[PDB]
Amino acid sequence: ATAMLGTHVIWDFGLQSSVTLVIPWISNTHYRAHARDGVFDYYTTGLV
Amino acid sequence: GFPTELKPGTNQFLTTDDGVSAPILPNFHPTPCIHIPGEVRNLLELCQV
Amino acid sequence: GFPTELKPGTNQFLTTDDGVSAPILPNFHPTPCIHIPGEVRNLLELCQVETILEVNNVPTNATSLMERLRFPVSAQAGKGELCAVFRADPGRNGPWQSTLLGQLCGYYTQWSGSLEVTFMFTGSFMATGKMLIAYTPPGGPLPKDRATAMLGTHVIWDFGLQSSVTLVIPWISNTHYRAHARDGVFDYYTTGLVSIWYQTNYVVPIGAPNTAYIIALAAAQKNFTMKLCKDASDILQTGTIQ
Amino acid sequence: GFPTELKPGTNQFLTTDDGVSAPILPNFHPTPCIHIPGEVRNLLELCQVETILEVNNVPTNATSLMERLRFPVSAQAGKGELCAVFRADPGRNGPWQSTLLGQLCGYYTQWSGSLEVTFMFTGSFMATGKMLIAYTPPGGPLPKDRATAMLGTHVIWDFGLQSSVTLVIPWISNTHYRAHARDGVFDYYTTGLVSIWYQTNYVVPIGAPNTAYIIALAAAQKNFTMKLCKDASDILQTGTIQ
Amino acid sequence: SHENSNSATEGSTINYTTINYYKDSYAATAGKQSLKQDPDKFANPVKDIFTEMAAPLK
Amino acid sequence: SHENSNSATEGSTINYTTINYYKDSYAATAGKQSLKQDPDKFANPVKDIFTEMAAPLK
Amino acid sequence: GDRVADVIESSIGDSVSRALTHALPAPTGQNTQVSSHRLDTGKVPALQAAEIGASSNASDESMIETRCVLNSHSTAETTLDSFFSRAGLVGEIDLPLKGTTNPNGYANWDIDITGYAQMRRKVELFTYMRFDAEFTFVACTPTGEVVPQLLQYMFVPPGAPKPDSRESLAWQTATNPSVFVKLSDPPAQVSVPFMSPASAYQWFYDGYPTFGEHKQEKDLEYGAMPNNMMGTFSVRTVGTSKSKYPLVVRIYMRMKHVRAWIPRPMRNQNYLFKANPNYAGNSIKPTGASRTAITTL
Amino acid sequence: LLQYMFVPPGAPKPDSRESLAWQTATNPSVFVKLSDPPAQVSVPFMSPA
Amino acid sequence: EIGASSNASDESMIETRCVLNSHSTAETTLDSFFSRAGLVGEIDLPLKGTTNPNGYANWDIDITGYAQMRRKVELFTYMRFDAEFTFVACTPTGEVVPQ
Amino acid sequence: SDRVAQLTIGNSTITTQEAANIIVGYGEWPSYCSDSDATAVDKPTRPDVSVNRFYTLDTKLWEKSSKGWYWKFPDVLTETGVFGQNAQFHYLYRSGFCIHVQCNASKFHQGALLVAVLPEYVIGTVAGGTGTEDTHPPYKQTQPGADGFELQHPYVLDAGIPISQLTVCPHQWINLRTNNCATIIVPYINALPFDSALNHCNFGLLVVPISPLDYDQGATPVIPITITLAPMCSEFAGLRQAVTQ
Ligand SMILES: CCCCCCCCCCCCC/C=C\[C@H](O)[C@H](N)CO
Ligand SMILES: CCCCCCCCCCCCC/C=C\[C@H](O)[C@H](N)CO
């Protein structure tokens, strides 16, 4: 229920074996540096 | 109230009086009339047979 | 005083008389009418919407009423066995009473038109089968076998991606309108019978149910009309409604 | 005798029937109408004139009735304290009954429109202050504090040369018209609440009263209309008037 | 019709539309009034009119 | 006539033909309605309409 | 002023209701066209897919070989006004002498047409309805007798004072509409407009009339629609002393200038209470007649 | 005071002076007194033929 | 203090949408409000009584005897109009007699 | 090309490879309230994408003995996401809905659900069985919330009306051998241009098995039915503090 409030796709299995999840660029800054634990977690993209 | 005055005859039921009286079935359309042979229009037609 | 003479009818209150009568609230303007979806203009609009036909009108205990909404089919012995039957009379007691068509029909004395019953197969996707559905016009008694049934108006249904099939019950009457048919002389206005037979068989592979259900939906065709507005046969009240 | 037929209604006396009836004085010409100032044409004209709203409807002893005409304000403790509250329902029992608007409102079953209440400060010229006045649309209960009250429609009044300020109570309703609201299911037609809070404080220098009064005047906006003419709830008569 | 002008509202600044069957117009029906209003007469009878946007006293 | 437009069906997409003797139109008779119908609203409210001849699902 | 693209190309605010269907004139039943045999692949009118939610489009012409039939059968009698503009009983009021109910010479009837099943069932076929109405009041003694008695009927809108005695001051009727008529006179009859604050009366309101906690005590108010509460209808014998005869008043309503929206399943269980769809749980009966077997008549 | 009601075939027939059928919500009924002149109405051609 | 009502409109106190108001103002016209018959006089003609046992009665035309009506008219100081009078007679029980 | 479909609105996209077209209730699309139908004068808030998106609120398990369930709108969403919030701070609300009921199985399972929308779905009680008691349904039964509520007497829709005639309401069927979802689009239905999202439920959604679920021993027996819906053309007015009921 919580997960659903975010950007999502509902995949139905069928002849089309695959489905694409787009992870849209949603950032405060124009570029992100590589994110890693610590302050650089600022540049994190998010979760799937 | 538009002024009227009732005259003799009022309320009588004359069996041969050809008048208008309220329709019980509004917007009712009768079954259509197909062709039927032998329609008579006047009794005199029969008085000649 | 302008001379008038009163005629018979004077003072009567005819419930269907369309007249003029004094307005109690002078200069009163009603609340305006905003847009509301789903406006209906004529009851015939509703008579064309399929509602469920309770072909299986046998169970009566509260807990089994949902079962009247569908009838079954299953693997057979290949003898062109009979699956189900019912009278096509829409304004008669029986299966049609479950349909809105039959219900609205009760508010009119006469009707005229073709009818249609669409059957939807709800078995598994692996189940196949061919059924023979037949409308038997007035005069022909309940077909004793599929060979007899076949001489009437019929449709041969093949199960496939199209889950459903439509049986048209064409208007075949001597009179232009039919009054509601019921046992007795009014059986004159009967529409006829519908019979469902196994054309081949209900075949299924290993792993699929041997019994499946069919749901029947019914409505009227576009040549359908009703006449002579009357009160319905049912009055849903026992004592006073409080 | 011209053939007629009498219909239901015949002989009834409908008090609101707008008909013709025989003139008792033939050829009588009335005294001419000279000019008279102040002619009113529509009751709505009067519904736009502010009359005093008895917000302070608590005192009931004869000698204190004049006190209901005004409520007070005085120096506080700076906690955004509550000064007064009342229901915005114009045709409901309460403060509005003192206004002509509320009175005329009683002769109609339904109404629709925005309302306005103008508050006039009658303190000394040296007194200052800022008040927060808020209209709380239906559904929101009486604001427990000024922070809650503030989320609704509001006006922040600053005392100055302009003695008064106007609070508009905009027409915010689900229905196009409201019937008179009263406890029970008709609370459905309630308009909402008005709350008055200290935005800052009533400040005054040495030598000026620490308490002053506010007078509230109320009327209707120009989108205001009334519908369904009815008799008022009050009948100012005990026995026979002799 | 061709009747007497004895109605209480003869010479009124509003046009009424009524029905009658007698030579005297006061016998006529109430009819339909004209829909004009003049609130200002009562709500704003000031000599020097002020604007909404302005400060009433200046 | 010249009456009030207070009938419940004022501003309706169908033309009625009625009789009346009062200034208020709701006093008028039921009259004759217009004979239009729109079954599809209920019988066929699908977005992408399919033909009779076609197979509903493809 | 707008500038960012998404704002310009936004459809936020479109107040036009895109409609997928439209009404067509249909004064008569449809005609039947000639048809001949068809032996084709690909063309399959008989097969449908009910899951879609639409009714079968298969016509007679495509399922059997039809002749031509010019159908002139009228569709006029099934219009809303034809169906509803027929007066029916909606209220009954008793004014007895020595009684338990109204021995005080007057009565107040809260206008509610759901007290009688015939009428109720018809209207409940729709969810929303807008119309004007003609009311007819038929009065007589309990034996169906006519007596020289004078009555007063008064429409008491919500908010107006309700008479509490045969001598209430309310009977002055200075602003309410009242009808004075004798039993000897033909039945009184009047026209009433569409009085709801809503654009339409609604036989079904799935909600509560007020905000708050909806505890057990206030559950009697579930489905209470003030917009349908038009007021009271009060009657009284016109006098200071009690009337010499016991009376009964039957109220008949004939709808006219009718409009309806949102058709629904028709009631199939006996009614038990006014404005409330409660049904006897122990006597839940199937909609119609039943039989012993599906393969027999 | 009497009530006359037209009961088309299929409509419920009153079985008592108090039958619910007398509600006459859809059937046409005429309420008239013996003291009134005779009731009179028009009926259409109703056969299916 | 000026003596005029507030000219402040909704549009200037809050952000408003557009609303096309077609609500009629017809029912609040003087005739709509007043042209509704109401009780103004009651006259008793008893047999054996203290008041009119002589078979007749004189009623000085004054509509201020009944509150409902009186209160409405007194909303104005001056009034000019025509009037329709209706006389409803019966016995004290509301009975009709051949008199 | 009718069996396959994609619904994208807000930041949510739904797919299906076994659809059966789309129903547009009463043949009409959700629209915003016009300046002539409107009555309230305050300028409304139309949050767009933050509330007109797909919320996936519930999952029920279909069993060989299930009776059926119903949910009330907009009751189901009043406590969810940005939509729930607006429904709380505002008195007035109006909107349409796009409903997507999901249920897949296998080519060896069978059964058919009826998915319909019933405007003004007033619930009734069994009146003490005998019918002598005037009982009324509790708040939790009239506005079951997101968990919905199971029908006690599906045949009469717990309201004295034949489920057999329910097809007269916008609907679709999920007949496993054919499709795996129903999609119904609903416009605002009311006699007022706006109303309380709290006190009034414009319509109820019903999901009832008419042809029972069945399959042989060995096939997956857990057959969920999931409810997903998206408000459309959401409008709000009459702002104040938040209120939950
Ligand atoms: C001279 C007085 C005549 C009495 C006038 C009666 C006017 C009544 C208006 C008709 C209103 C239609 C019925 C409305 C709602 C239903 O009866 C129930 N309340 C539904 O719960
Ligand atoms: C056939 C005779 C009918 C009786 C005719 C009565 C005509 C009366 C004219 C109406 C006058 C309006 C009332 C005038 C004044 C008030 O009642 C009081 N006097 C005010 O103090």
Side-chain angles (χ1 to χ4, degrees):
Chain A
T2 307
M4 157 268 292
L5 304 171
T7 299
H8 64 97
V9 182
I10 298 186
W11 180 20
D12 191 41
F13 300 160
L15 313 186
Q16 309 316 310
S17 55
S18 323
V19 74
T20 295
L21 165 71
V22 163
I23 304 182
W25 174 254
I26 293 170
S27 164
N28 52 344
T29 54
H30 270 232
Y31 288 92
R32 286 206 231 259
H34 285 277
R36 69 172 161 287
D37 296 295
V39 303
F40 274 68
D41 231 331
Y42 167 100
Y43 301 119
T44 189
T45 302
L47 309 165
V48 182
Chain B
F2 178 73
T4 66
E5 210 171 283
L6 276 43
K7 301 292 192 177
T10 294
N11 297 332
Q12 73 192 178
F13 170 30
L14 174 55
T15 75
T16 48
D17 191 6
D18 182 8
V20 174
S21 268
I24 65 167
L25 293 169
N27 309 322
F28 166 96
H29 282 267
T31 303
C33 197
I34 70 182
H35 176 71
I36 306 176
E39 175 165 19
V40 355
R41 294 190 183 61
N42 195 297
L43 300 185
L44 264 6
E45 273 158 347
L46 310 176
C47 295
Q48 297 184 239
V49 176
Chain C
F2 178 73
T4 66
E5 210 171 283
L6 276 43
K7 301 292 192 177
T10 294
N11 297 332
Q12 73 192 178
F13 170 30
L14 174 54
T15 75
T16 48
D17 191 6
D18 182 8
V20 174
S21 268
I24 65 167
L25 293 169
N27 309 322
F28 166 96
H29 282 267
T31 303
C33 197
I34 70 182
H35 176 71
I36 306 176
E39 175 165 19
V40 355
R41 294 190 183 61
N42 195 297
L43 300 184
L44 264 5
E45 273 158 347
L46 310 176
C47 295
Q48 297 184 239
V49 176
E50 303 174 332
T51 44
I52 307 175
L53 179 63
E54 283 178 29
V55 170
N56 179 36
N57 63 316
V58 314
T60 61
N61 46 108
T63 54
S64 290
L65 301 175
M66 287 301 290
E67 299 180 9
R68 327 179 99 213
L69 298 170
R70 78 286 184 295
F71 58 103
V73 292
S74 62
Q76 300 288 158
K79 306 298 170 56
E81 31 271 320
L82 171 77
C83 172
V85 316
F86 60 105
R87 288 215 186 71
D89 308 16
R92 189 184 192 138
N93 287 337
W96 296 81
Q97 294 173 258
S98 65
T99 70
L100 177 61
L101 174 64
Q103 280 312 319
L104 290 178
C105 214
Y107 284 103
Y108 288 88
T109 307
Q110 290 159 44
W111 62 282
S112 180
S114 299
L115 311 174
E116 64 99 356
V117 176
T118 295
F119 307 89
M120 176 174 58
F121 177 52
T122 65
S124 65
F125 166 105
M126 297 289 348
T128 71
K130 295 179 180 299
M131 306 291 280
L132 179 318
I133 314 182
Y135 164 57
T136 304
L142 190 52
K144 47 167 187 172
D145 54 48
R146 183 239 272 164
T148 307
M150 157 268 292
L151 304 171
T153 299
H154 64 97
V155 182
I156 298 186
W157 180 20
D158 191 41
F159 300 160
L161 314 186
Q162 309 316 310
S163 55
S164 323
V165 74
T166 295
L167 165 71
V168 163
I169 304 182
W171 174 254
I172 293 170
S173 164
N174 52 344
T175 54
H176 270 232
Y177 288 92
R178 286 206 231 259
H180 285 277
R182 69 172 161 287
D183 296 295
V185 303
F186 274 68
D187 231 331
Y188 167 100
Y189 301 119
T190 189
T191 302
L193 309 165
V194 182
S195 23
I196 299 169
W197 313 73
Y198 285 82
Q199 183 66 324
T200 43
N201 191 23
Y202 166 103
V203 174
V204 79
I206 289 179
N210 303 74
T211 300
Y213 300 87
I214 295 183
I215 291 193
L217 300 143
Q221 295 286 70
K222 303 192 173 298
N223 58 4
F224 186 85
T225 50
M226 295 186 296
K227 205 182 80 162
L228 220 167
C229 212
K230 74 179 182 68
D231 264 311
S233 48
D234 288 326
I235 299 182
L236 306 194
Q237 171 183 38
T238 275
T240 67
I241 294 167
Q242 39 211 290
Chain D
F2 178 73
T4 66
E5 210 171 283
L6 276 43
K7 301 292 192 177
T10 294
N11 297 332
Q12 73 192 178
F13 170 30
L14 174 55
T15 75
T16 48
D17 191 6
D18 182 8
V20 174
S21 268
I24 65 167
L25 293 169
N27 309 322
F28 166 96
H29 282 267
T31 303
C33 197
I34 70 182
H35 176 71
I36 306 176
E39 175 165 19
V40 355
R41 294 190 183 61
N42 195 297
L43 300 184
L44 264 5
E45 273 158 347
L46 310 176
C47 295
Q48 297 184 239
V49 176
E50 303 174 332
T51 44
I52 307 175
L53 179 63
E54 283 178 29
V55 170
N56 179 36
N57 63 316
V58 314
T60 61
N61 46 108
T63 54
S64 290
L65 301 175
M66 287 301 290
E67 299 180 9
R68 327 179 99 213
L69 298 170
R70 78 286 184 295
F71 58 103
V73 292
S74 62
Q76 300 288 158
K79 306 298 170 56
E81 31 271 320
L82 171 77
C83 172
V85 316
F86 60 105
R87 288 215 186 71
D89 308 16
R92 189 184 192 138
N93 287 337
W96 296 81
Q97 294 173 258
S98 65
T99 70
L100 177 61
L101 174 64
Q103 280 312 319
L104 290 178
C105 214
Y107 284 103
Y108 288 88
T109 307
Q110 290 159 44
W111 62 282
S112 180
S114 299
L115 311 174
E116 64 99 356
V117 176
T118 295
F119 307 89
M120 176 174 58
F121 177 52
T122 65
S124 65
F125 166 105
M126 297 289 348
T128 71
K130 295 179 180 299
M131 306 291 280
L132 179 318
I133 314 182
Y135 164 57
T136 304
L142 190 52
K144 47 167 187 172
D145 54 48
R146 183 240 272 164
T148 307
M150 157 268 292
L151 304 171
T153 299
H154 64 97
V155 182
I156 298 186
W157 180 20
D158 191 40
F159 300 160
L161 314 186
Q162 309 316 310
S163 55
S164 323
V165 74
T166 295
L167 165 71
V168 163
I169 304 182
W171 174 254
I172 293 170
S173 164
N174 52 344
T175 54
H176 270 232
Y177 288 92
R178 286 206 231 259
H180 285 277
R182 69 172 161 287
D183 296 295
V185 303
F186 274 68
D187 231 331
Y188 167 100
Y189 301 119
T190 189
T191 302
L193 309 165
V194 182
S195 23
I196 299 169
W197 313 73
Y198 285 82
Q199 183 66 324
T200 43
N201 191 23
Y202 166 103
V203 174
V204 79
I206 289 179
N210 303 74
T211 300
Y213 300 87
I214 295 183
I215 291 193
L217 300 143
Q221 295 286 70
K222 303 192 173 298
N223 58 4
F224 186 85
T225 50
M226 295 186 296
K227 205 182 80 162
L228 220 167
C229 212
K230 74 179 182 68
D231 264 311
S233 48
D234 288 326
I235 299 182
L236 306 194
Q237 171 183 38
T238 275
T240 67
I241 294 167
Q242 39 211 290
Chain E
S1 301
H2 190 297
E3 52 192 54
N4 279 133
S5 302
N6 31 40
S7 169
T9 49
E10 218 68 56
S12 190
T13 184
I14 60 172
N15 306 297
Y16 290 64
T17 169
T18 69
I19 302 168
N20 196 355
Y21 311 116
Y22 302 92
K23 65 187 161 181
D24 300 297
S25 58
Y26 63 79
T29 68
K32 290 178 62 192
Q33 309 201 311
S34 193
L35 262 45
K36 305 155 180 293
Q37 311 189 188
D38 177 14
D40 295 353
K41 175 179 290 195
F42 313 93
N44 206 64
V46 295
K47 164 169 176 293
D48 303 298
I49 43 186
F50 60 91
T51 315
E52 188 180 316
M53 308 278 253
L57 292 176
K58 193 135 65 286
Chain F
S1 301
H2 190 297
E3 52 192 54
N4 279 133
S5 302
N6 31 40
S7 169
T9 49
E10 218 68 56
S12 190
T13 184
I14 60 172
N15 306 297
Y16 290 64
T17 169
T18 69
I19 302 168
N20 196 355
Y21 311 116
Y22 302 92
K23 65 187 161 181
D24 300 297
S25 58
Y26 63 79
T29 68
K32 290 178 62 192
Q33 309 201 311
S34 193
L35 262 45
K36 305 155 180 293
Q37 311 189 188
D38 177 14
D40 295 353
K41 175 179 290 195
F42 313 93
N44 206 64
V46 295
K47 164 169 176 293
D48 303 298
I49 43 186
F50 60 91
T51 315
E52 188 180 316
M53 308 278 253
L57 292 176
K58 193 135 65 286
Chain G
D2 315 64
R3 297 290 277 73
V4 290
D6 69 275
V7 170
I8 286 172
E9 296 175 56
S10 184
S11 61
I12 293 187
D14 184 55
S15 63
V16 308
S17 298
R18 288 198 294 166
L20 301 189
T21 66
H22 63 308
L24 297 173
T28 66
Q30 207 182 61
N31 295 28
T32 289
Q33 289 298 62
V34 180
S35 80
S36 199
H37 48 274
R38 167 181 47 278
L39 304 182
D40 285 301
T41 66
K43 290 182 168 62
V44 72
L47 302 179
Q48 306 286 298
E51 295 94 326
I52 296 181
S55 302
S56 184
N57 51 33
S59 51
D60 297 28
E61 291 86 340
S62 69
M63 298 291 306
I64 69 164
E65 291 194 48
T66 57
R67 70 168 294 149
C68 166
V69 178
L70 302 179
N71 187 348
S72 57
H73 293 171
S74 186
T75 65
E77 248 196 314
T78 44
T79 63
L80 265 35
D81 274 8
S82 291
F83 180 73
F84 287 117
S85 203
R86 318 170 83 85
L89 189 72
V90 294
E92 194 135 41
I93 294 178
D94 285 288
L95 283 199
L97 304 174
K98 290 282 298 172
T100 174
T101 62
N102 301 293
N104 312 307
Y106 78 101
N108 294 325
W109 180 64
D110 278 350
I111 304 160
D112 190 325
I113 71 175
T114 66
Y116 298 88
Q118 267 193 165
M119 187 67 40
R120 182 167 172 177
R121 190 171 187 256
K122 293 176 77 180
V123 304
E124 291 190 358
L125 164 59
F126 298 102
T127 306
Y128 303 110
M129 283 187 78
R130 177 181 174 106
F131 56 87
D132 293 317
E134 168 161 279
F135 279 88
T136 318
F137 310 95
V138 178
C140 60
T141 76
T143 65
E145 232 207 323
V146 184
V147 295
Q149 183 63 42
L150 180 60
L151 303 181
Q152 168 172 6
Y153 307 126
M154 170 167 66
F155 176 38
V156 177
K162 292 193 182 190
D164 59 344
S165 66
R166 165 185 58 237
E167 286 125 305
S168 194
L169 295 176
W171 295 112
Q172 281 183 38
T173 199
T175 308
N176 295 332
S178 288
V179 166
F180 291 85
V181 67
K182 316 181 186 72
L183 268 59
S184 45
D185 295 326
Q189 192 187 68
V190 300
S191 287
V192 174
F194 174 69
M195 314 183 280
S196 187
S199 309
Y201 303 119
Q202 62 180 100
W203 310 120
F204 307 86
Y205 171 66
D206 173 19
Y208 292 97
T210 58
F211 287 96
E213 303 177 304
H214 296 284
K215 297 177 175 181
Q216 308 303 62
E217 23 289 312
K218 313 296 184 181
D219 260 352
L220 74 172
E221 47 174 50
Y222 168 68
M225 192 45 255
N227 298 155
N228 300 334
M229 300 175 185
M230 291 315 97
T232 309
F233 168 89
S234 312
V235 52
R236 72 145 179 188
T237 56
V238 192
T240 39
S241 310
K242 45 179 168 63
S243 170
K244 307 168 62 181
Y245 336 77
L247 306 169
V248 191
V249 176
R250 292 179 177 64
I251 297 161
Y252 295 82
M253 181 186 96
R254 174 196 153 219
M255 284 168 273
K256 56 178 187 185
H257 311 151
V258 183
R259 291 184 72 183
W261 300 260
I262 310 296
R264 39 206 292 139
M266 295 195 76
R267 183 77 186 183
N268 74 334
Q269 296 301 143
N270 285 171
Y271 284 113
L272 298 174
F273 310 102
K274 303 187 183 186
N276 167 56
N278 285 175
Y279 53 100
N282 299 167
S283 319
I284 292 176
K285 53 171 183 174
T287 302
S290 319
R291 52 177 169 164
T292 60
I294 207 173
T295 56
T296 204
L297 294 189
Chain H
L1 180 60
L2 303 181
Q3 168 172 6
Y4 307 126
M5 170 167 66
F6 176 38
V7 177
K13 292 193 182 190
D15 59 344
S16 66
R17 165 185 58 237
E18 286 125 305
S19 194
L20 295 176
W22 295 112
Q23 281 183 38
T24 199
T26 308
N27 295 332
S29 288
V30 166
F31 291 85
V32 67
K33 316 181 186 72
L34 268 59
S35 45
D36 295 326
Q40 192 187 68
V41 300
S42 287
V43 174
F45 174 69
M46 314 183 280
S47 187
Chain I
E1 295 94 326
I2 296 181
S5 302
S6 184
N7 51 33
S9 51
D10 297 28
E11 291 86 340
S12 69
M13 298 291 306
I14 69 164
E15 291 194 48
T16 57
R17 70 168 294 149
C18 166
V19 178
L20 302 179
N21 187 348
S22 57
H23 293 171
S24 186
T25 65
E27 248 196 314
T28 44
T29 63
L30 265 35
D31 274 8
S32 291
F33 180 73
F34 287 117
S35 203
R36 318 170 83 85
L39 189 72
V40 294
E42 194 136 41
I43 294 178
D44 285 288
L45 283 199
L47 304 174
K48 290 282 298 172
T50 174
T51 62
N52 301 293
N54 312 307
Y56 78 101
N58 294 325
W59 180 64
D60 278 350
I61 304 160
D62 190 325
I63 71 175
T64 66
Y66 298 88
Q68 267 193 165
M69 187 67 40
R70 182 167 172 177
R71 190 171 187 256
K72 293 176 77 180
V73 304
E74 291 190 358
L75 164 59
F76 298 102
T77 306
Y78 303 110
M79 283 187 78
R80 177 181 174 106
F81 56 87
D82 293 317
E84 168 161 279
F85 279 88
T86 318
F87 310 95
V88 178
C90 60
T91 76
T93 65
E95 232 207 323
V96 184
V97 295
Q99 183 63 42
Chain J
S1 186
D2 179 56
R3 307 261 306 116
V4 69
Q6 188 187 306
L7 313 171
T8 296
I9 176 180
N11 61 326
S12 60
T13 287
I14 290 179
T15 66
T16 176
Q17 300 197 224
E18 269 170 295
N21 214 321
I22 295 171
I23 288 297
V24 190
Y26 292 110
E28 165 174 343
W29 286 79
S31 78
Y32 290 90
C33 184
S34 77
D35 299 319
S36 64
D37 272 12
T39 184
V41 317
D42 67 326
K43 186 186 295 190
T45 173
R46 313 192 179 85
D48 209 40
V49 289
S50 64
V51 318
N52 296 144
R53 62 183 304 280
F54 280 119
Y55 295 107
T56 304
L57 278 46
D58 199 25
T59 297
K60 294 256 170 288
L61 298 183
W62 188 358
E63 265 151 355
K64 300 189 183 188
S65 63
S66 293
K67 282 190 286 191
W69 311 265
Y70 68 73
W71 295 255
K72 302 304 204 62
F73 290 67
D75 170 51
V76 293
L77 263 180
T78 53
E79 286 161 50
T80 304
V82 175
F83 174 94
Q85 288 306 102
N86 282 93
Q88 287 175 46
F89 284 86
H90 299 88
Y91 164 33
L92 304 181
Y93 140 95
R94 110 189 289 275
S95 100
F97 280 107
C98 173
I99 301 159
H100 190 66
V101 182
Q102 314 138 66
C103 181
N104 57 93
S106 90
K107 278 147 168 55
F108 292 73
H109 290 68
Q110 57 181 55
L113 300 169
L114 170 63
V115 183
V117 166
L118 174 59
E120 301 303 341
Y121 183 15
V122 177
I123 294 293
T125 60
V126 296
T130 61
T132 56
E133 189 186 357
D134 191 5
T135 51
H136 309 289
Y139 182 84
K140 72 166 184 293
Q141 215 206 316
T142 65
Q143 312 202 330
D147 286 330
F149 196 93
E150 169 170 275
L151 286 171
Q152 304 166 299
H153 301 97
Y155 190 78
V156 297
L157 297 166
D158 289 10
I161 47 174
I163 184 174
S164 53
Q165 299 171 17
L166 184 59
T167 53
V168 74
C169 293
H171 71 279
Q172 282 212 309
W173 295 84
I174 295 174
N175 179 17
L176 303 177
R177 64 173 283 128
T178 295
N179 53 314
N180 69 31
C181 63
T183 309
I184 305 173
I185 294 177
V186 183
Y188 189 65
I189 305 176
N190 201 6
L192 324 186
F194 278 88
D195 217 342
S196 178
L198 302 187
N199 300 332
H200 189 196
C201 284
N202 307 120
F203 68 83
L205 169 69
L206 292 117
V207 178
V208 190
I210 308 295
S211 185
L213 171 60
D214 202 7
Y215 47 89
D216 282 7
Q217 265 303 301
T220 302
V222 180
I223 303 310
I225 296 171
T226 301
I227 308 297
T228 294
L229 49 103
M232 295 192 270
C233 306
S234 300
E235 272 171 293
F236 296 102
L239 175 71
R240 22 75 165 167
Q241 65 259 47
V243 163
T244 57
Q245 67 177 303

